[PDB]
Amino acid sequence: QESNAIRMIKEACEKNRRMMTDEAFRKEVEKRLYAGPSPELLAKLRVLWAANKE
Amino acid sequence: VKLSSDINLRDFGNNEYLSSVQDEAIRFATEQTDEILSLYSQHADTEGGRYVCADTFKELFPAFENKEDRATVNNAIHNSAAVLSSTQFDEVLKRDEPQKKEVIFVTGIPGSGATSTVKNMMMQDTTKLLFEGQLARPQSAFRKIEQCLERNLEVTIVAVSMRAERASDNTYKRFNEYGRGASIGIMADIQANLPDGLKQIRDKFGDAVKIVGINQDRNSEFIDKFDDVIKMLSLGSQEQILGRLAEKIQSDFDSGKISRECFNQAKGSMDLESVFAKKEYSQQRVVTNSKGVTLETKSANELWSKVEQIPVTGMKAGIYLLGQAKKAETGQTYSGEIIYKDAAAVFQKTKNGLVRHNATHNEERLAKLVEIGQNVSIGSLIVKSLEYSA
């Protein structure tokens, strides 16, 4: 019978179909993809970059 | 925790900016490996460091902070990000977690929505690691797959696919919202060679690696058998796809669908003139008359059918075989009526027969300087009207 990863992938395909007929759902997935670093992460990165300048 | 390998340098040439960004990225990745992996694991959107992708690691580099720089610095920071991914990949593998037995590799042409597919996967309790990256050149992936199978982990490779043209449209939107798109060179390289890479994985490791596919042109249809995955992914040669992509991004720019910035990042380091010159017109002709020009193509059995009619006034009756046009030699001047024009070529009727000019000459655009039906001289870029009334 089918492994777990293969179910996960099939479930992922169903959600990809949902994106095509639900503008609000697509927009929350695409907002997450392109969000970039959170302000919390960005604060941590700044310290990291600044402490290790040449 | 050190990098799992030395980061390979690319050659940036006389571009001092990218050359120095490269060395800064390599220095950062090599000396701060520990703090970088820790930020990626604990603080980025990575499922606790189990979603491993070079494109997520790019967001931890100073050169990538500002949206408007990402297209320019991408190639310069890539290898540093990819080696950071391998290092991360190895750190996840070393964690003792007998419950977690499954490793998923996800790949696809940029703009195919592979990343969006990964975000729509929900982590299961048996999921050890999720890696997203190119498998067209699979050598690097061999080292990762080997390590999975040494640890008795089950490996699944998921190939996400879409026609280049529609994927290209998605890359434009990503460039405009996020600052990174994709070059036509990498898009064509990937879509042409991906089957070969997946072939090389099946032949090194066998049934031990499950290989599946997602066809995004058939509403994300899941494809289960390897032979069927190879079928779906057969979408042309590298020359064919590159040729089609070059025509698309040029037409898209010429008509005003994409800005110059979006066009330049899609161009990448491609000489478009050299792509356009490789285009073939052997089964094609142009029929001119008093109403306009009609582009026709021949089938295998010698039947002509219409592709495109363009209305134009003032041309006489004519039939021109486009594949028999003489290439324009550089430095010489050619005079006469333009009889056909597209994204790749401009065809001109001279006294010594039909001539073909590349639609681009040394990054200057010839095709926009002339109209079909117009009598001109073309030389070198000097274009003159020869139109008169007497």
B31 and B172 housed in the same domain: yes
Q: Tell me the two tokens of residue B290.
A: 């008093």
Mark which of B269, B304, B335 sits at the end of a domain: B269
CB proximity B369 to A under 8 Å:
no
Nearest CA in chain B to A10: B222
Number of domains in chain B: 2
B57 and B112 housed in the same domain: yes
The residue of A4, A20, A22 whose CB has the most chain B CBs within 10 angstroms, and thus the best one to mutate to test that interface, is: A4
Nearest CA in chain A to B178: A34
Q: Which residue has the tokens 């970039």?
A: A36
Domain residue ranges in chain A: 1-54
Q: Solved by what technique?
A: X-ray
Mark which of B213, B242, B269 sits at the end of a domain: B269
B8 and B80 housed in the same domain: yes
B113 and B47 housed in the same domain: yes
Mark which of B237, B269, B301 sits at the end of a domain: B269
B347 and B242 housed in the same domain: no
The residue of B34, B77, B117, B120 whose CB has the most chain A CBs within 10 angstroms, and thus the best one to mutate to test that interface, is: B120
Q: Specify the length of chain B in residues.
A: 390
B227 and B321 housed in the same domain: no
Name every chain A residue with its beta carbon within 8 A of the beta carbon of B221: 13
B351 and B206 housed in the same domain: no
Residues spanned by the domain of B289: 271-390
Nearest one of B313, B311, B239 to B277, comparing CA atoms: B239
Q: Which of A3, A29, A41 sits opposite B116 (nearest CB)?
A: A29
B379 and B242 housed in the same domain: no
B137 and B240 housed in the same domain: yes
Nearest CA in chain B to A54: B24
SS3 letters across chain B = CCCCCCCCCCCCCCCHHHHHHHHHHHHHHHHCHHHHHHHHHHHCCCCCCCEEEHHHHHHHCHHHCCHHHHHHHHHHHHHHHHHHHHHHHHHHHHCCCCCCCEEEEEEECCCCCHHHHHHCCCCCCCEEEEEECCCCCCHHHHHHHHHHHHCCCEEEEEEEECCHHHHHHHHHHHHHHHCCCCCHHHHHHHHHHHHHHHHHHHHHHHHHEEEEEEEHHHCCEEECCHHHHHHHCCCCCHHHHHHHHHHHHHHHHHCCCCCHHHHHHHHCCCCHHHHHHHCCCCCEEEEECCCEEEEEEECCCCCEEEEEEEECCCCCCEEEEHHHCEECCCCCCEEEEEEEECCCEEEEEECCEEEEEECEECCEECHHHCCCCCEEEEECCEEEECCCCC
Q: Give Cα B8 distance to the centre of its chain.
A: 22
* Secondary structure letter of residue A52 according to DSSP: T
B277 and B252 housed in the same domain: no
